[PDB]
Amino acid sequence: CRIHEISCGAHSTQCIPVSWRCDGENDCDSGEDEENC
Amino acid sequence: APTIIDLTCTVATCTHSSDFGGVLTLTYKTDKNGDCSVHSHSNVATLQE
Numbered sequence: 462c463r464i465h466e467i468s469c470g471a472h473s474t475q476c477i478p479v480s481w482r483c484d485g486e487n488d489c490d491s492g493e494d495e496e497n498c
Numbered sequence: 499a500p501t502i503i504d505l506t507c508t509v510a511t512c513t514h515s516s517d518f519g520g521v522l523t524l525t526y527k528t529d530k531n532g533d534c535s536v537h538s539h540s541n542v543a544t545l546q547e
């Protein structure tokens with residue numbers, strides 16, 4: 462996606478902005494961003 | 499910035515009290531995820547977020 466967006470893993474096509482990483486909410490499909498943080 | 503099209507509004511419950519006694523839900527269609535700024539253009543009601 463965009464330079465300022467990170468996808469919720471390769472297995473999913475959804476991409477979210479990097480500001481949502483480790484915000485305390487499961488913004489991904491199954492909370493991939495909140496993992497290993 | 500995201501583009502929001504075909505946005506219509508509705509209110510679930512309301513109770514005019516000193517707290518934030520009221521919830522409203524917004525429906526829309528967008529192209530990409532992001533964060534938007536939300537504001538009430540009137541004076542009768544004040545938002546929280």
Ligand SMILES: [Ca+2]
Binds near residue numbers: 481482487
């Ligand atoms: Ca998150």
